[model samples]
Target chain A: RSNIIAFIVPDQNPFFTEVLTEISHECQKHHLHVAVASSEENEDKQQDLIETFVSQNVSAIILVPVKSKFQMKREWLKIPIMTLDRELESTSLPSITVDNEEAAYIATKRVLESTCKEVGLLLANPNISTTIGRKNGYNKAISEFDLNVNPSLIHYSDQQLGTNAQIYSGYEATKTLLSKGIKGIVATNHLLLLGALQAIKESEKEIKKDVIIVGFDDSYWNEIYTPKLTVISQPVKEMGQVAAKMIYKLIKGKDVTSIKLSTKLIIRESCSFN
Target chain B: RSNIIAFIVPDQNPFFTEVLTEISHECQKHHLHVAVASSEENEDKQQDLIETFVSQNVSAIILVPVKSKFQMKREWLKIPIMTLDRELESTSLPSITVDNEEAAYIATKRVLESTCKEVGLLLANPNISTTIGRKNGYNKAISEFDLNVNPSLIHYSDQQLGTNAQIYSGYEATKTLLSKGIKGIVATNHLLLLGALQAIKESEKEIKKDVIIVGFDDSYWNEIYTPKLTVISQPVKEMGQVAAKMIYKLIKGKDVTSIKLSTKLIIRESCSFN
Candidate 1:
């Protein structure tokens, strides 16, 4: 138990797979053990797992937190805590995350630069700070580029869809945008990206040749598509390694700091930049 | 080692997710331990992992077999075996599977009876026996109805696509079918069905109104889509429990038999019949 770290994750998000793999590799090098618990996207489940880990006397807790605003019991904070992907600034717990604003800004900027007449954005669970950060970046890019900012074009999961309702919500949002004849679109996650692209293809639009699309996060099948997607690829593996390292430091009674990694914009055929 | 069941699966399939969850549930009841390993659809990795499990002296082996024709070293048969999803008839091994052929047949029949002029089928790897079974059902339905089977309408993973590349591949196939203007489509898995729907909605084709679509396997999001999908819903939870029970019986030195679960054709808004 002295060398064990409790890693709490949300449902089977592909992003978490990369993170956990890297965490496992890092833990192996330090001769540490990781006990993983999946919350299945439920807030109560996440809290219960955290408490279970605490009772088990694990060295530290590393969480891909479920809801940032949901308060954790003060008793559970006796052990060192490290959050990933989603930030809990109010809690002041150290977090490892990507510069979502910069990544989203770059993606939106590319569409504007490509001479697309109008572009829309699809986001999951605006209540999530990550989504808020992404939305902020998109709005910033629109303002900076002097493009029209239509509130209706900014689709939020809460508006007409449930929280983090990725694929289904993305499909509906993309369909609505297509019906309105929007030529460019941005989807903020892997599931949403896949959903949006499905909408475009089913509509008989020829990818970048007809409707320009940009997606956040890279997926295994992204490159295989006819017109491969232009994506903002987050440094997910690095983030995981950094979080693991930070938790190890905390366990060792050493000072540690939060991390914010940068993202890269891969210009593929989806943006017609090819 | 005497109380462990080595569970080997391929890919991150949703059906397997449900099955594994039930396996875990059943294992808890019988005080058995399950050690899981994923092959990621790689033949070599799967063979190697199975060898490792064998070396560990696990009590029994339960596999969602990958590449059944790819010779696994004969030594693996020394222990009790139970296969899942994919069958291994040549080895005369006990297995658990859904009736893929019958399920696909009913799904295809629904579209044909809807008076669709042309229908398409989306399938994964042709090399996979499960995909083959699904295709056989589709073909049988087409023949029974005296409808033309245009080879071009049947999309397999090998033809211009990779083997079972989940969401992305599903999207691409659905898009291609839409472009060719097929009025009806049968997608043989959850990912393919979601992709096909995205294409339809994006293309502004009203499901059941302009085109009819049938999908194999049901997912949480299926009912949430604007016009719910008409799907062949497999008894996934029951299949998992049955498989777990069979493997437990094998471990206990009791006679066990293979099982095949049936599926139900659920009619919804997508087929126009609703």
Candidate 2:
């Protein structure tokens, strides 16, 4: 009667907590049991937890890694694992991810459309697949639009695997950019966007008119701000559903394939010239 | 061979997406497949997807609900259902959630310790459990501090179930408080905290000295902002680990009970006398 599923998450961000909250709400009616674990940026701890889940023979396991390194690859021998955010290239495990490249491209294009001559980027860790893709997308857009891609304006930071480090990176990078007279910017993640917004205000600048800041992840605050935010938003609910559906399919021994959900460009006050 | 786990999530907030990403990463190591369906804030859609998962006979289900009122009580049958957020009043299903009340209380206490008299609150929809707990915590603190909680100082909004809305609500509420000469403000969530910070800056009011602010969910930016920030931080990884540990115990048919993790009051520039 161990009809349980194990979910692992980044231990402190409410952002992911909210998404998990939605998922759990749906699970309540299904009469399922769920448990959560945190890697807390410790691979050994994550490995120990996975092994424990395996011993319990849990029906499924869900985890968010704190680092881009898929060091937990050794534990796959015993359980049914579905990689979520930054997928390991060595595994054919089905993955659910935001179209990082596409999203970055869209964010960059939005910046290019703005009147700003120079743009800055606050990206997720450079080694992570999603961040790498997003960087490529942003760079591609810069070239396609003939905008200057000043390397000085590009900054990187590690979010410590599921924590919103991107926010602080975005803030620091944007603060530097603001000081350098940069007008437009694209933040690669939600944490970064919030951080950038904080930085802008700290510099006593208004969003949108004073600084065209487009971000990834169009959350609720985007609708509430004085200058609304534009973002390369993902259909998170859809992505959640996709990840769930894929897991179910794989359990059924169906020819499960990895799927990448589409990211929509949400234009708001930050990027919208009108 | 069909041992899929169906996971549901809200829209594309980076917070949840990041969690999903981490979960997926963990699952990949176990060779587990995750099937997902996006509710997109649609109860009907959420219900339909659950039914589909049930029909497919997924091994287990994990859900994060769209709305507190949107119920699919009868849809997911004959499977173990686990909820991520928004625990039902008397459901037997296992769930995971952060201690919002405790977090809010800590944040409030930090604000009340300062010299600020009037505290404005930007809260979420009344139906959401976490938000309700936060509001209650604030009220409790206000009563404990022997301060008058003016209803005029409190504003409620849907904020769409993520930190994003809370930020905007904070911004608008801060503006309203500014007009009324309110000296301190508290937001029950991170988004509100971010927006409130922005609003305080725009209003040219300094936190702690002019209008103190404290928020739920501590981030580095909260510490790095010009006035910094006072925040109640949840041990996310610990919470996840507890939830996971509890679930593992229960899955083993052990008498596992509900565990409430603690929230921390991180005092920084936002609520200081600086």
Candidate 3:
């Protein structure tokens, strides 16, 4: 295998790509190269990609799996494999992920404290661990806040096309939420947040004045948004550094453990109480 | 030809990722495999990747070139090469790029017609052909409109790196423009457009009230944006389909020619004057 690590993800969300930038930089310090591939959330395509990388004899692989419950052949064990951003259940493969549960919990809890009574949630696929964890956090915050969750207020963007259509999914979900008269909302990712914001404005509703909002991922748009948005910011840069470091360790025949970094809630006007 | 074909991009902008999503679907129909990566705008790194993919016998390569002036080896000629999004200065390499000059010109011309003079222009690095074409269009529109172009109203984000930093570059440029009291603007790419919008709002100004704007790349945010946005919409989906079809032709030893597609202006509320 050449001195290259095959970095694969389910989609091309900026979060994963942002991590790749740091991972690429870290790997470059040791004179190694990183080649990335997207699965487009296709499980078969994901398999084909791993097999192709193995056949090419790449030293190590970092995959953000399309499915959480995946099984791989033992014959492909010669090359080191690690997971990033997403985890595969029932595997020894170490993964680097933000505490997505905490991300959603802080977001939901903060919005719950604000003027919002019925908080809507816009999530990605239900099949992913990040989705499950964030959902659990949402439920936990609702229970702790002495509120019963409404199934209708929670919406999942069930498309497997990944983040390319995620903005639309988020938009559609928020559209439904607004129609149902739910004001405060929590979107579990950046693409969904963009969609949620769009639906809010298109309905002639206003942020803070009409709808309270909290979302995951900090973006330049959050600061520039008129009322600004509060959000759960993942440690993407650190996650990349750690993922690259762990993969290098695996490459050098050393063992590494899974890492779960914390998420911080950056409070801003969108979730502020009047 | 081998089933594996490599798609290389200069950055992880949504523009390229959107194209990748479509390319993957198109290639899947042919049962051809696609492995995508980013060059991160490093000429040395880009060369290394092409040689690496060639070594692996990738059937063809699709590139969004980092710079217009670049050279490659004759040995790598065995595999069919195609360019997308951006073009090379002098190459038989077929490209799928929108009429970038017309995109900028239309955006500028419309803004000029909207009772706004001193239209600020925000563009990518001065080096690339995309930048030159867009700049030419803006100047053409200014000359045709009989306005003496103020040099201060034009700004170039000269960073060699592509879109990630492009947002910051656009933001800084627009901040300068806003401070200089220019109320009309055209940003030449999606990231720049986002930054322009951000800076305009953050400056404590309101869109359609304090300013008029037109931008490149149609996104969901444009339509959902308050007051909506007038933008030049590149044919990303069509570009992907055409690119896949062209590369397959080249792989089959069929002669192909470079295609320059047209971009449409989606006139929304942002450029509308009172």
Candidate 4:
């Protein structure tokens, strides 16, 4: 195929690399040359990369964004860009994402079904759509049960870096929440989950028994940890394939309509009494 | 038209979101809803997501990866999975990537041309295909210059929590190296470069004068840093769009072939002076 495609991602996140690699494999099978870039969480470079791609006259673009709905919509009008999983608030760029509201709601419901009276939360970036969706879902579930949405129960960290979540900054946040009388924890993003878990563990506190924690992503390590962890699950490969199809149809001038995928709550030791 | 698409990413890295947003925009044009899932660096979850996608029968999958070449090859074979950016070594899953070997070579070439005598390298995951390519290129450049490849100078960190080549870890690594009489550094990843730069600034050592540091993946921060950093330029948007197009073509049963694009060296204030 003569069409050129670019996949732009944030820098050095293992998840992005792995998913991008799979996309690259498919592209190679189709005989297309591909380029990869890490934005390093900067706006100008992303802008430059977008401009360069446009100037290079690429046929299409597949991007994993660096900003939330408002931030992304501000500078996303330059070319034919495709939003992969999470969506932008503005419709300038198209998006594909699992139902965050559903995923978060399910996760929160699982927690509510538990025996814990109070819960702590580790929230990812509050700006991005995915995190917000999860946050919304969590809050909605709390409200549905007439539970107070305690702002004191929340901590913020990059979901991508478990170590960052485990750092002093993360530990301090969790400490603040633990200082308050909380019995359970729910991390909206995976990294904060790791960090909150580490803080709890290092503080010699028992999880699930003393303070249960539920992570958002079921990354590999979660399964093998000393104590098993529970996660809210999304179909990644299906998401990938769906993204591939949607963008392809757009490229083919197909009359595609928008749709939403549902996410499930995966039960585990972290959230269950078992 | 009723199909929901998902993009698989490592986490909620804004860059991935931005790129995915582009695809989402396109999907929106055709009335397709998009969803996202972050693996949070978990291989099993990545695997599970793929299986879930297959079972759910999503239209197509666009995957940005989690840095497992061997496993990804096995996982992607079962579905219409298309990988973007980083590759799965020799998997036939249809993929695209910038020529990391060349990118590393260019970055290495710039480092070698500098006046610095001994150089240290900080890489992300050693298992990653890109790291392999970069390491090979760095080794080649070192051998070409008849320099002994010191094992101590090479370090690989998977967590990479804001330390390594740029400032924090860079300072520590530099201090350790300087204690052992090392003079230069080359960071293979973008974040590592920032850390290395930070180390240089904190140590009060001039980059070219006392210790030189060169990094891969040119970003906006690199350009405007106190000493504009030397970097390898991989075409970011080009790779994103290319991967998208390749996935598009492969889904259509069109001809596709493995490809490797070129990388350029941007020698800035760090190396440009000398």
Give one digit per residue, the lDDT tens place, for model 4 in A1-274. Answer: 2244666664443445445545544554444434455444445556655655564555567776666643444444444567765566666566767898788788877778788656676666665677788888888888888888777676666544322323434556677777675767777655456556656765756665667667776654454343667888666656666666666666666655665777677776777653
Candidate 1 per-residue lDDT, tens place, A18-126, comes to: 6765775687577565545556556665766676567656688888776667776899887888888888648778888888898888988888888784789998777
lDDT of 3 by residue, B1-274 (tens): 4577788887666778778777877887877777777777777778877888887787899987878997768998888899888889888898888887788889999998977878999988776789989999999999999998777888877764756678878889999988987889999988888888878877887777778889888776677566688889888889888888988898889999888899999998989776
Work out the TM-score per prediction: 0.60, 0.59, 0.94, 0.49
Give the runs in model 1 whose Cα sits over 4 Å from its true position: A2-6, A31-37, A57-60, A78-80, A159-164, B1-258, B261-274
- DockQ versus reference, model 4: 0.03
i-RMS, each model, one decimal: 9.2, 10.0, 2.6, 15.9
Deviation of model 1 at B83, angstroms:
7.7
RMSD in angstroms between candidate 2 and the native structure over all alpha carbons: 9.0
Tell me which of candidates 2 and 3 scores higher on DockQ.
Answer: 3
lDDT of each: 0.74, 0.67, 0.83, 0.61
Q: Report the number of the highest-DockQ candidate.
A: 3
Give the proportion of true interface contacts each model preserves, from 0 to 1.
Answer: 0.00, 0.00, 0.42, 0.00
List candidate 2 segments past 4 Å from native.
A10-15, A25-30, A65-75, A158-164, A272-274, B1-274
Docking class of 2: incorrect
- lDDT for model 2 comes to 0.67
Name the 10 consecutive residues with the lowest summed lDDT in model 4 chain A.
A160-169
- Across B1-274, the per-residue lDDT of candidate 2 in tens digits comes to 2435466764433334444445544454544435444565556656766765666565566677665654446655456666665665556666777777777777777777877767788886676677688888888889899987678878876645444555667788888888788887787766566677667767776655777777776454454455566677766565544544443454345665555667778766667676
Q: In what order do the candidates fall by DockQ, top score first?
A: 3, 2, 1, 4
C-alpha lDDT of residue B145 in model 4: 87
Error of 4 at A236 (Å): 0.7
How does candidate 2 fare on TM-score?
0.59
* Best-matching candidate per lDDT: 3
Q: Candidate 1: lDDT over CA atoms?
A: 0.74
